[PDB]
Design brief:
Length: 56
């Protein structure tokens, strides 16, 4: 399935996507992407839209 990440940062705003077998694996990949770009925050997940949001 395709999952989306919305980044609502102070200095960085955008969206990205990844392909994964389950929501948990998409979580490990997205936490890595956020760390490589300097974003840190609180995580939320909406199972109906397969979307993870990180708000700083």
């Amino acid at each position: 399935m395709q999952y989306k990440l919305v980044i609502n940062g102070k200095t960085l705003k955008g969206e990205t996507t990844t392909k994964a077998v389950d929501a948990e694996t998409a979580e490990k990949a997205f936490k890595q992407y956020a760390n490589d770009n300097g974003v840190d925050g609180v995580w939320t997940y909406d199972d109906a839209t397969k979307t993870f949001t990180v708000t700083e």
